């Protein structure tokens, strides 16, 4: 094939042109994102039961749905929460590779059949089935500065005016509103109602009759009286449109003749649908839009498209309305692509400087400068066929492969240059010989490197997906590189490279390059003499090798293992947690403190604080809140002291002395739905209908035991809430029947007033919106207010609640959890420092077998996957090792020689572990993939030394030591040229402290460190491996 394209350089050009155009097309048309879909498909069922408790939601909704979740394909597990905010959330997680559209329709179709089994109120609100995505492209905050609008007023504007236009924008997959559009809020008055002998029932009845769409018919409709001239639609009653119209609703006509209207017994205003979430931005009332990117969409294009939509929305904004960007992933993504792309261009520039240093002719510097980009462009074309996106993972998977790509180009050109200098052959004749020496080895390396990387794509779960991005990207580039190395570079080398006179090693030249040629030639002599002394005393270096292997195994165990390094993303969160039963106001007062702090003590770093009162990741309620802090540009936060890590720590400290509040700040993870490493997700299951209390006792018993093993387990805690005091009211059936009061009226009156009741819809300025009836705040605050509510008996007299009810305090669950249909309690925890996740999990498993009868357990989330991905690592490591041996066995035609190559692996890994350890880094995916690329190059270098040496012995009948010394002498230059260029190529990544430096540090540090040891050791150790192995097996 090389020989074919040496005679046919135009063909080689055509293949290069076709690759360059195909790749160029792909690069502009490929989708740009931050991260691809890593997490498996999860379908979430969400419903609201207005004013329902945890148990009511669970017993009327959660259980009824779970029993109907049958006949759905590829379901792994099902988990649900039922809380006192009236919400249920049933999550169904599916097998990786499941069609999310099919999984969603199957779940949603089985729900539709369960709908008639649910309560009227739950059917009316609606049960939403959506696909799980915790990745927002950006959040667009909408504020109001002149204190004219409330958060409900701002939210209605955004719903009516902006939201739909943003949903219709190119690349926008989903838009979630932070709040609700207006709702017609009827705030009822028990005093006024009782005075006119009316109940919440009477108010609902009247709204339903006087706020409705009534079907009429037609004038001259078919079949008509033959001779009819006109046909017209009759328009009867239509829905109300204003607070004024709702206030005029007639409830009762008195005897004297005065009319009782809805405005007489209640306050009427356009309010929000619920008042649980109070959102404020830098103290001011706020709303906004959580925008998600669509499938196969460009994240930079969408972001630009959304900003241009908002830009032309501003003119029609009311007084004081402003758009703000607390969160946008686009600047961080645009930085990552650029720095990755910048590294590839610098890497090529660096080879030019290095190629010219050794070879000292501009024609030889162009062969790599042409060949490498063709492979890089060409790689994008292959990514496109795999249905991949330009993302941080693939962009860094490409940067990690530079050493392998740059080498393919250098190895081919250098060898042709060497041949022409040593044998004095013309360019075309020299290339044939030169390629004939390496054409078999290059193909052998492709097969070995494939066997290193291809197995990496067959890992399952979330982390198996992150590995597959690197696997395909690296394999695809390395495959194209070998193809280009056999097809294009031979043709260029035979047509472009100038001839060299035999024994011209540039010692005849003067100036700097004359010194360099004379310098490098002496150093090659010092080198070969040095290897000669090593090959006399081989047994010493074998002992020095086992010290490295033992030094490797130590650092490997000592080094902590994470998934992805944390990044200064210009944002982080402060979680606020007050005690159980704490009110909205109390939580608000702490969030106000937290905001003051960031805008006062951190006014140099912090741009905005988005304080959300009433929202918590561990469970909603009035006593929980999160403050999402948005910083300024990375340019205006210089040094490590003004970073998200440093601020996070200061903030957590300052809030440690907050009285009656658990307040701490923390950075966001690289991936949202990956959790942490050494972290586990335990599920305690009620398998024998014990109850909630007996399961709590069992959880408490398991937690107490876990706390006596601080050396194995640390931070073993429940994920859910604790039992809170609740107000139990017993309706007396006998007294109710005696007084002539119906239970339906009692139940409606209490639920409507205290809980709120969704009656029907109305059209507010051409938008259908909801109508709620609820008690005015001051009449549904305390137990004393219960007896202030009256129900009308059949005989007409008004009966207070006090007459037919009795109340007491008890304890009940504000958040009831279920796992796989049964009651459950999620326990989070992690392995103690120096313990593997499997150790901790076997202990939790052991402690759990000693729990009360009818208490089971199970692993979910990451721990479910770990158990499955842990069974695979053995098979893939094993398969990978066997195929490398086999590929090297076919190349060398020896069962034994392959060992000489395979023995180089630790030489690259030792430096990696040293650099990582001394910089204070972790065993993260970037480091791990960097090990594979370091091993590949060091293994590639070793392969050509053994091949050169072996063919001398086989073809020129040279001696073992003679062939080895000649081999390493010939490979010294190209090895040093790749390393010099590549080490300089990744040097900026190690020292980079800017935006996205976390990822760059993980790539650069473990590569530079590994490249230094793999270069210095391998040139001395490969000759030792080859000689010791050949001596063992004749």
């Amino acid at each position: 094939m090389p020989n074919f394209f040496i005679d046919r350089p135009i063909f080689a050009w055509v293949i290069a042109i076709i690759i360059m155009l195909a790749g160029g097309l792909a690069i502009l048309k490929l989708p740009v994102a931050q991260y691809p879909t890593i997490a498996p498909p999860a379908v979430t069922i969400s419903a609201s039961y207005p004013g329902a408790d945890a148990k009511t939601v669970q017993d009327t909704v959660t259980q009824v749905i779970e029993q109907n979740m049958n006949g759905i394909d590829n379901l792994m597990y099902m988990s649900s929460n039922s809380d006192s905010t009236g919400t249920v959330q049933i999550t169904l997680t599916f097998e990786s590779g499941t069609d999310a559209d099919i999984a969603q329709v199957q779940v949603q179709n089985k729900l539709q059949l369960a709908m008639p089994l649910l309560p009227q109120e739950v059917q009316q609100q609606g049960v939403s089935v959506e696909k799980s995505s915790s990745s927002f492209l950006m959040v667009v905050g909408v504020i109001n500065t002149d204190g004219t609008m409330t958060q409900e007023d701002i939210s209605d504007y955004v719903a009516a005016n902006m939201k739909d236009a943003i949903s219709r924008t190119s690349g926008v997959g989903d838009v979630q509103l932070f709040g609700s559009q207006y709702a017609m809020r009827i705030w009822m008055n028990p005093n006024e109602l009782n005075k006119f002998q009316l109940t919440p029932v009477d108010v609902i009845t009247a709204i339903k009759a006087q706020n409705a769409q009534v079907a009429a018919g037609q004038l001259g409709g078919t079949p008509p009286v033959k001779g009819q001239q006109l046909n017209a639609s009759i328009i009867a009653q239509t829905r109300l449109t204003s607070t004024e119209e709702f206030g005029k609703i007639l409830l009762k006509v008195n005897q004297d003749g005065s009319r009782v209207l809805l405005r007489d017994v209640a306050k009427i205003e356009l309010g929000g649908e619920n008042y649980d979430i109070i959102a404020e931005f830098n103290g001011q009332p706020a709303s906004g839009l959580g925008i998600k990117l669509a499938t196969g969409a460009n994240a930079l294009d969408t972001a630009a498209a959304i900003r241009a939509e908002l830009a032309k929305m501003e003119p029609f904004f009311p007084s004081g309305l402003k758009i703000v960007y607390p969160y946008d992933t686009t600047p961080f993504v645009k930085i990552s692509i650029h720095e990755a792309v910048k590294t590839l261009v610098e890497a090529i520039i660096l080879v030019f400087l290095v190629m010219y240093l050794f070879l000292q002719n501009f024609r030889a510097t162009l062969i790599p400068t042409i060949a490498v980009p063709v492979v890089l462009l060409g790689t994008f074309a292959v990514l496109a066929a795999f249905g991949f996106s330009i993302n941080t993972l693939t962009m860094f998977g490409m940067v990690l492969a530079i050493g392998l790509l740059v080498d393919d180009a250098i190895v081919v050109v250098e060898n042709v240059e060497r041949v022409m200098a040593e044998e004095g052959l013309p360019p075309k004749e020299a290339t044939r010989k030169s390629m004939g020496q390496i054409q078999g080895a290059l193909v052998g390396i492709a097969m070995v490197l494939s066997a290193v990387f291809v197995p990496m794509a067959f890992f399952g779960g979330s982390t198996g997906a992150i590995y597959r991005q690197f696997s395909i990207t690296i394999v695809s580039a390395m495959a194209l590189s070998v193809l280009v190395a056999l097809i294009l570079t031979p043709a260029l080398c035979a047509t472009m490279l100038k001839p060299i006179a035999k024994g011209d090693h540039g010692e005849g030249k003067k100036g700097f390059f004359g010194w360099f040629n004379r310098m490098f030639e002496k150093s090659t002599h010092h080198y070969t003499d040095s290897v000669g002394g090593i090959l006399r005393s081989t047994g010493r270096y074998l002992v020095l090798y086992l010290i490295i292997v033992v030094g490797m195994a130590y650092l490997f165990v000592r080094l902590p293992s994470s998934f992805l390094p944390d990044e200064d993303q210009g944002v982080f969160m402060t979680m606020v947690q007050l005690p159980a039963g704490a009110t909205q106001e109390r939580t608000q007062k702490v969030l106000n403190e937290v905001t003051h702090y960031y805008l006062t003590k951190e006014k140099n770093n912090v741009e905005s604080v988005f304080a959300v009162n009433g929202f918590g990741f561990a469970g909603r309620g009035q006593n929980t809140g999160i403050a999402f802090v948005s910083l300024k540009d990375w340019a205006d936060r210089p040094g490590e002291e003004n970073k998200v890590e440093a601020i996070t720590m200061r903030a957590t400290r300052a809030f440690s002395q907050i009285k009656d509040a658990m307040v701490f700040a923390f950075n966001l993870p690289a991936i949202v739905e990956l959790g942490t490493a050494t972290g586990f997700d335990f599920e305690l299951i009620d398998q024998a209908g014990l109850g909630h209390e007996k399961l709590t006792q069992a959880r408490n018993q398991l937690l107490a035991e876990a706390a006596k093993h601080p050396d194995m387990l640390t931070s073993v805690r429940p994920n859910g809430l604790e039992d809170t005091p609740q107000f139990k009211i017993d309706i007396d059936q006998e007294k109710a029947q005696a007084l002539g009061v119906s239970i339906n009226d009692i139940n409606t009156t209490l639920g409507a007033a205290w809980g709120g009741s969704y009656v029907n819809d109305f059209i507010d300025r051409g938008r259908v919106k909801k109508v709620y009836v609820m008690s005015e705040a001051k009449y549904r605050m305390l137990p004393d207010d219960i007896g202030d509510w009256y129900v009308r008996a059949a005989d007409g007299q008004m009966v207070p609640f006090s007459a037919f009810s009795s109340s007491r305090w008890e304890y009940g669950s504000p958040r009831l959890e279920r796992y796989n249909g049964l009651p459950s309690m999620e326990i989070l925890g992690q392995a103690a420092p120096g313990k593997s996740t499997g150790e901790a999990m076997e202990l939790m498993e052991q402690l759990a077998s000693k729990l009360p009868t009818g208490v089971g357990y199970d692993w979910t989330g990451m721990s479910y996957q770990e158990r499955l991905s842990g069974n695979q690592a053995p098979s893939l490591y094993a398969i990978s090792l066997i195929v490398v041996f086999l590929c090297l066995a076919a190349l060398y035609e020896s069962w034994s020689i392959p060992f000489s190559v395979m023995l180089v692996v630790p030489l690259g890994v030792i430096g990696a572990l040293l650099a990582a350890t001394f910089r204070g880094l972790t065993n993260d995916v970037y480091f791990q993939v960097g090990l594979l690329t370091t091993i590949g190059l060091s293994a590639k270098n070793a392969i050509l030394i053994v091949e050169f040496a072996k063919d001398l012995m086989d073809k020129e009948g040279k001696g073992l030591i003679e062939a080895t010394l000649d081999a390493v002498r010939m490979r010294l230059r190209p090895i040093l040229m790749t390393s010099l260029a590549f080490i300089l190529g990744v040097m900026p990544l190690v020292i980079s402290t800017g935006a996205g430096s976390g990822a760059q540090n993980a790539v650069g540090t473990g590569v530079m460190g590994g490249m230094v040891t793999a270069t210095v050791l391998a040139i001395f150790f490969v000759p030792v491996f080859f000689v010791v192995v050949r001596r063992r097996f004749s």
Binding site: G581, P725, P783, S806, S807
Partner: protein, 156 residues
């Protein structure tokens, strides 16, 4: 309230004997109560922590402490069938005939949940068998409606 008062409430509820002990030594207010007016004795009487109940009563805990709805620790102990706590409380001067805001006595609740042993202890200490609630219902009336024959037999 106080700092240690909240720790005692949370500790007395969980049944953490060794934390309650340290708190009693440090002088944590035993008369500390949450929003609903539940003292550490209520929480110990409710969740059935006998050892702590005894410790609180020793440390000058109000045995006839009532909540915002007028319920005592004996109301809770009698309702959730904690026989030992009931006896300990009655021993330390718990009002056997304590009515709540509904006129419900510890006997009414013991009868309703059908705790036969507890009903006899209250009766031993002089529970008014003819005590009526806000609806004129005695402990006998509850047993007959509940259909508990054994309990109806004890109240003649």
């Amino acid at each position: 309230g106080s700092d240690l008062g909240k720790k005692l409430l949370e500790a007395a509820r969980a049944g953490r004997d060794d934390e309650v002990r340290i708190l009693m030594a440090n002088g944590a207010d035993v008369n500390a109560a949450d929003v609903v007016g539940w003292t550490p004795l209520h929480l110990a009487a409710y969740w059935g922590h006998l050892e702590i109940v005894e410790v609180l009563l020793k440390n000058g805990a109000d045995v006839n402490a009532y909540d915002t709805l007028g319920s005592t620790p004996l109301h809770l102990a009698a309702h959730f069938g904690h026989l030992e706590i009931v006896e300990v409380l009655l021993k330390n001067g718990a009002d056997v005939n304590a009515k709540d805001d509904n006129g419900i006595t510890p006997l009414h609740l013991a009868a309703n949940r059908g705790h036969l042993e507890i009903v006899e202890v209250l009766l031993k200490y002089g529970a008014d068998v003819n005590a009526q609630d806000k609806f004129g219902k005695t402990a006998f009336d509850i047993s007959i409606n509940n259909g508990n024959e054994d309990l109806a037999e004890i109240l003649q």
